[PDB]
């Protein structure tokens, strides 16, 4: 039941590739849960290469009285964003999302409507983007029976012409084996496999192929937790890229993560990309 | 005094904005009352609440009580053989607050992010009137507030005293903050600033998050408290005068029987 959506389809492998290391960036997040319903998150990203300071304050209002969720975010470039989520209002698996962005300093507005239908094995989703440049409509439908799953994504724009962007993603998802192949307009061909040998060993393999210039690139990643608080991550790319990350829980909420990407050669040309991450949860 | 303004811009901006914010606040208060829903209360939790109230009342009012009965109460509560609080144990939920994290959370939560909805209203109001001059504030202001104050007028020589409609409505929001309670009462929920923030007396005062831990805490609090019979001092009234019973006895004649 509840088949995976298009964005979530394969998100395990990308998340393994994404989460774990943030070299070149400084991670600083604080999450706070209140007693009744209040959620507060303050995250701060610091860059040493570009010397940039980025951050967002995110306030979450979980209302189970009617299924309403109120989210308000604030960035550093004077951008204001509000979001309303309604789930299980009158239908079975209907979800309505309203996202709005407005700037007080200058004047700029953007709108986004998300709609989601979830059923026994049928997943429907429609995103309508309202902007001055041009409205766009994007629909993703996922169908599967037991383990065989296939999803279709389409993107259409009324501003220019009959532009249509096709996406066909076919995969096999089960308890410990997860394989997924994504096809973009018969041009992009991606294949991700992810498996778990034990409760401590995780392996992932990614392949990318194209029909235009016949470019092929593959990469493998391993994740292993020595202890419930100590974890290690390694990733190797096709050409020479190697990345190592190590995470350890220091205080019962405080965790420290270290990331290092090495690009070195033997012709006197080498480079290090380091990154520190630290978060607090309350 | 300069910049002679029209008499049509005061009757089409000031009064509309004032009535708009007044009725927005009133509507918010009424909708907050309407949306309020009761919380289900289970009998065991109710009984736990009443026992807590009984023990707290014993703690507060324990001087005007016989020592023997006070010790009987305290033994019944403590009772090392059986114990009411010791034996009676309900389900326990795994907690998550921690000393340093919660000590910090006391300030992290706060009410910092409760101004944005009013900023949205101000932004819409300012969007409606692009180039406008509502009023001037007598209070002298610094030129570094002019970008926030004017926000739509291309003038660098003009003073910052002349405000736009955005700051006009912003000051209008807190101007009636103490006026709303005048017509409603002490418990007013018409605050335009705190829209999402729930402000109420609070349904179901008693919140036994961990029944067992509260039981143990009250068990030790009742063991700590001493006994001092405040009745034992009766000699103060002994040597005194009785003139108040002469007091309204004079004023109890004047009323007849209906």
């Amino acid at each position: 039941a509840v088949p995976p959506t298009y964005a979530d389809l394969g998100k395990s492998a990308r998340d393994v590739f994404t989460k774990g290391y943030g070299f070149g960036l400084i991670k600083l997040d604080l999450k706070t849960k209140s007693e009744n319903g209040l959620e507060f998150t303050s995250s701060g990203s610091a860059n040493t290469e570009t010397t940039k300071v980025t951050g967002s304050l995110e306030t979450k209002y979980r209302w189970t009285e009617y299924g309403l969720t109120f989210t308000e975010k604030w960035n550093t470039d004077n951008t204001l964003g509000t979001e309303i989520t309604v789930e299980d209002q009158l239908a079975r698996g209907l979800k309505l999302t309203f996202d709005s962005s407005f700037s007080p300093n200058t004047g700029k507005k953007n709108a986004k409507i998300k709609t989601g239908y979830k059923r026994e094995h049928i997943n429907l989703g429609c995103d309508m983007d309202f902007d001055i440049a041009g409205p766009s409509i994007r629909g993703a439908l996922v169908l599967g029976y037991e383990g065989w799953l296939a999803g279709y994504q389409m993107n259409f724009e009324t501003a220019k012409s009959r532009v249509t962007q096709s996406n066909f993603a076919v995969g096999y998802k089960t308890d410990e084996f997860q394989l997924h192949t994504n096809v973009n307009d018969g041009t992009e061909f991606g294949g991700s496999i992810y498996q778990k040998v034990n409760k401590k060993l995780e392996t992932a393999v990614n392949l990318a192929w194209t029909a235009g210039n016949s470019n092929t690139r593959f990469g493998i990643a391993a994740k292993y937790q020595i202890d419930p608080d100590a974890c290690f991550s390694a990733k190797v790319n096709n050409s020479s890229l190697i990345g190592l990350g190590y995470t350890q829980t220091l205080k019962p909420g405080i965790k420290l993560t270290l990331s290092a990407l090495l690009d070195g050669k033997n012709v006197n040309a080498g480079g290090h990309k380091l990154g520190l991450g630290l978060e607090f949860q309350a | 005094p300069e910049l002679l303004l029209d008499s049509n811009i005061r009757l089409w901006v000031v009064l509309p904005i004032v009535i708009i914010t007044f009725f927005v606040g009133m509507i918010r208060h009424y909708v907050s009352i309407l949306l309020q829903s009761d919380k289900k209360l289970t009998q065991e939790q109710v009984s736990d609440s009443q026992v807590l109230i009984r023990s707290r009342v014993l703690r507060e009012n324990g001087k005007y009580i016989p020592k023997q009965s006070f010790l009987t109460r305290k033994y019944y509560f403590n009772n090392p053989e059986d114990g009411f609080f010791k034996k009676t144990k309900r389900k326990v939920v795994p907690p998550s607050p921690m000393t340093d994290p919660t000590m910090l959370t006391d300030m992290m939560k706060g009410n910092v992010t409760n101004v944005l909805p009013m900023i949205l209203i101000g932004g819409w109001i300012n969007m409606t009137f692009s180039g406008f001059v509502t009023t001037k504030v007598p209070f002298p202001l610094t030129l570094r507030f002019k970008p926030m104050l004017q926000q739509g007028i291309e003038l660098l020589t003009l003073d910052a005293s002349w405000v736009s409609s955005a700051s006009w409505y912003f000051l209008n929001v807190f101007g009636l903050r103490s006026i709303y309670s005048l017509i409603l009462g002490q418990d007013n929920a018409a605050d335009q600033s705190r829209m999402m923030q729930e402000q109420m007396t609070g349904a179901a005062m008693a919140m036994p998050a961990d029944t067992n831990k509260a039981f143990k805490t009250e068990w030790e609090a009742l063991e700590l408290t001493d006994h001092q019979w405040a009745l034992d001092d009766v000699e103060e009234e002994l040597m005194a005068k009785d003139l108040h019973f002469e007091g309204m006895f004079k004023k109890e004649l004047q009323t007849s029987i209906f």
């Binding site: 309303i84 962005s101 407005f102 | 819409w124």
Partner: peptide
């Protein structure tokens, strides 16, 4: 608009009631 979209949800919810 940030305000026009926050009214469309109540509008739809109130429309779905008589229907």
């Amino acid at each position: 608009n940030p305000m026009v979209m926050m009214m469309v949800l109540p509008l739809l919810i109130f429309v779905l009631l008589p229907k």
